[PDB]
Structure 1
């Protein structure tokens, strides 16, 4: 939950790849299967 920015200037390339992944496939902070008695 925060800003993403890819600001480009003078670029001359043949292949480029900019990949920002904050959570791709994470049970991040997931309480899975808790039980309390």
Structure 2
């Protein structure tokens, strides 16, 4: 038996980020995996 009240089994998140363009400026409060 498991008897869980709150449960989450599997969550898969895949992020692909590629940047070829140049001359770009940014201001980010909090950046996880994105490309600037």
TM-aligned CA distance change 1:13 to 1:25, over 3 Å = farther
Structure 2 residues without counterparts, runs of 5 or longer: none
Give the alignment's Cα RMSD to 1 decimal.
13.5
C-alpha distance in 2, partners of 1:20/1:6? 36
The two structures have a TM-score, normalised by structure 2, of 0.26
Structure 1 residues without counterparts, runs of 5 or longer: none
The two structures have a TM-score, normalised by structure 1, of 0.25
C-alpha distance in 1, partners of 2:6/2:16? 21
- List, as ranges, runs of 4+ consecutive aligned residues in structure 1 with deviation greater than 4 Å: 5-13, 28-37
